[PDB]
Symmetry: C3
Amino acid sequence: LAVLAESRLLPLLTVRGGEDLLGLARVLEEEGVGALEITLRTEKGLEALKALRKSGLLLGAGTVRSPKEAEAALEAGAAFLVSPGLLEEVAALAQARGVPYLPGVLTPTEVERALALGLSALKFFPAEPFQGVRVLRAYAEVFPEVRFLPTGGIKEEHLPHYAALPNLLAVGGSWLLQGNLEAVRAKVRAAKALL
Amino acid sequence: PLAVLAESRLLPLLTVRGGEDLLGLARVLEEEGVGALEITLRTEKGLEALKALRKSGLLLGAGTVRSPKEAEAALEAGAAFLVSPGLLEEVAALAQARGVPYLPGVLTPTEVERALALGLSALKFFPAEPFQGVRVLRAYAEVFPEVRFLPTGGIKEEHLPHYAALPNLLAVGGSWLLQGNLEAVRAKVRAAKALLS
Amino acid sequence: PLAVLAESRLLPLLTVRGGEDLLGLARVLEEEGVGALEITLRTEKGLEALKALRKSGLLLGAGTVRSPKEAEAALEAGAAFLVSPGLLEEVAALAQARGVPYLPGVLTPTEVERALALGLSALKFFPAEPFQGVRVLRAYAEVFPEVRFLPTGGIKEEHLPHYAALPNLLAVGGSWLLQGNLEAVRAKVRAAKALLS
């Protein structure tokens, strides 16, 4: 997870075709972002993981819905797994394969269930609709051993507020990847400044 | 089985207190192209209302279902589908055994996944307005595109425009529709359909 | 079991850092008609504070309980009731074995239903303010009328008027009450009672 902690940002890419994936990889690396989450919303996601396999990025597969799908993502090139909510059988697969699994959670009951599965780096999703900054501030006090990766509706306007949180692994989202490579550079730098 | 809900786009929620004109309401709803009505089991007047409405022509839902035994009581009183505030696995078992739709309430992605694991893909989102329904459901449209949601809880006319843009709605539910007399109900239903277009 | 909480209407939450005048605080709370106090277990100081307050006349709660073993340590230090951030079924087992109240935190209707299935009907609602506490609890008053809630998390004076009107509150909990010296504590408690009335 050191790469994520170092990077502080986890860009989220839904692949629709035409993306300059290797150009993206180079830019992200140049800007000190060493990880990328590829969503599995389409079959294009797996192909993109394969295309990026050798790019130098720590690749995450997102929207994982099952252990079979998790395994397919790992075989395509993913180095870590992310799901919208907690899936105990995906936790089993990840532990079997020796890879990190960041399940989405929201509530304290869910945080406890993830911990009981040995998981202490957790996605908080969807962050903005569920008042992420204020929730995560609460969680910093009662779950101080947990690090969170809020994702969902995050935009520049919200970043200053997340910056003050002691319990963040990274901030995730698609906002970083809107526009051309020039725009990605600017958004990545702006985000690091705001954080 | 929920083609009626989907064409209706609206699911009025009635908590029965005594003195309601149930058959007049059913007539009005049908006239206005709303073919379903959820009757809450917040008290025992709810079961009597289902019975009274058995053969009105509406698809009747029973809400606030809290147990399999209460669900079975609702089916025997004339409910065609079951709704609970949160996810009740044993109610899902009863509904599946009886071949009726069950729309459990969920809020979080983990709860959506658990419902899917029980073979349920038409889910209530409850309570919708306090938990930022439009923005949450917008997020779920992307990550759970196989799921259709029925948000309910604090919905009012002011909120309907924002729900209109959602690709993943089965219907919008709530009691706001049924405030006032029958003329008011006609207006509120027509306004809601307009705001949801 | 929780008549004290109910009569108090307030549950002050103390995270102990060293230096606090615990026995003075206990005296003030009692004088002001607040008969309970929750001590968080965010560090080892918490257990020490429970021991220090053991015979102060307060109904002592242990907060931030994370396991059955920690729960048991809290009871042995003098806690009379147990509170956790979320629902821990094995803590419920320990509490029922020891004959003490356990107030688990819940947020969603599914979580309420799971706590009810464990025989638990006085529940914490946490974290209350970030999750739209007043409006969520208003919905729960209708669909879960047998449940009493203890909202905690980010509550401040400004929010109290809106909680006052809820029919399903066991008490309102939080640390805002304990910011300042003992005269400030007196003023905040009196203010909170007036705003909840």
